[PDB]
Ligand binder design. Structure first.
Ligand code: MET
Length: 247
């Protein structure tokens, strides 16, 4: 019974909503589901490593890799990809990145793993150039080669960038789709720039403890999260802000 229950820590939206949609499909396979939502991204891998949950559903592989680099006690594994959230830039004050003035302030999130993801959007917009000798996924602010608009950067918790946006604390603000939707923003209608879906390594995953990735429970969960019902749910409910991907 408890051996048939899957406890998962997930961010509120879309991840806990996708799990709630998957619940009756898991019962059809013989498994129950318990979902825990936590207050910030740093809590989810800790809960898993502490054995309070069986799995978490909140991050991408670069985030997971960074977390394990920082905490050698985390012996975690990717059980499989589910969905992609193309990253957004938001502004109350400018309509596009081409319109930002010299000295403009860019509010980055403080997510170490996503520093290259953010900067790559600015490089693709033609605002900065990054050192070509560094992989984009590994790029930081130290890797900026050219900055002809002399952009200045600030860092806010990913949980609070929706507030930096509403407060007009900078000229342009990065918000992860999960926290954008959690704040009642619609990323495809409200963002001023959206990340390309091409060549994108930031699919969100199910993570488990090492040695648990082929367990019956986790295979059952991966199965439901790749069903036609769950892919169609994702596609309809989030209006293209969230996209199902292969495992
Ligand atoms: C904790 S890594 C960020 C995850 C977030 N759901 C995104 O894909 O942008």
């Amino acid at each position: 019974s408890g051996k048939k229950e899957i406890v998962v820590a997930a961010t509120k939206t879309p991840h806990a909503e996708i799990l709630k949609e998957a619940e009756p499909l898991l019962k059809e396979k013989g498994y129950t589901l318990k979902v825990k939502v936590l207050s910030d991204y740093k809590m989810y891998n800790k809960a898993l490593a502490d054995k309070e949950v069986d799995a978490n559903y909140f991050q991408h592989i670069p985030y997971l890799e960074q977390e394990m680099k920082e905490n050698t006690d985390y012996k975690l594994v990717n059980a499989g990809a589910v969905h992609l959230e193309p990253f957004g830039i938001y502004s109350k004050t400018y309509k596009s990145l081409k319109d930002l003035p010299d000295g403009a302030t860019i509010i980055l999130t403080n997510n170490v793993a996503e520093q290259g993801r953010m900067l790559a959007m600015l490089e693709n917009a033609g605002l900065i150039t990054l050192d070509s000798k560094v992989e984009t996924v590994d790029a930081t602010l130290k890797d900026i080669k050219k900055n002809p608009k002399n952009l200045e950067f600030k860092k806010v918790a990913p949980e609070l960038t929706a507030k930096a946006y509403e407060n007009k604390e900078g000229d342009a603000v990065f918000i992860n789709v999960n926290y954008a939707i959690q704040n009642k923003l619609n990323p495809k209608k409200d963002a001023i720039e959206v990340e390309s879906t091409k060549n994108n390594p930031y699919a969100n995953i199910i993570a488990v403890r090492k040695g648990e990735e082929d367990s019956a429970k986790i295979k059952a969960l991966m199965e439901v999260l790749h069903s036609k019902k769950i892919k169609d749910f994702i596609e309809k409910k989030y209006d293209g802000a969230v996209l199902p991907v292969s495992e």
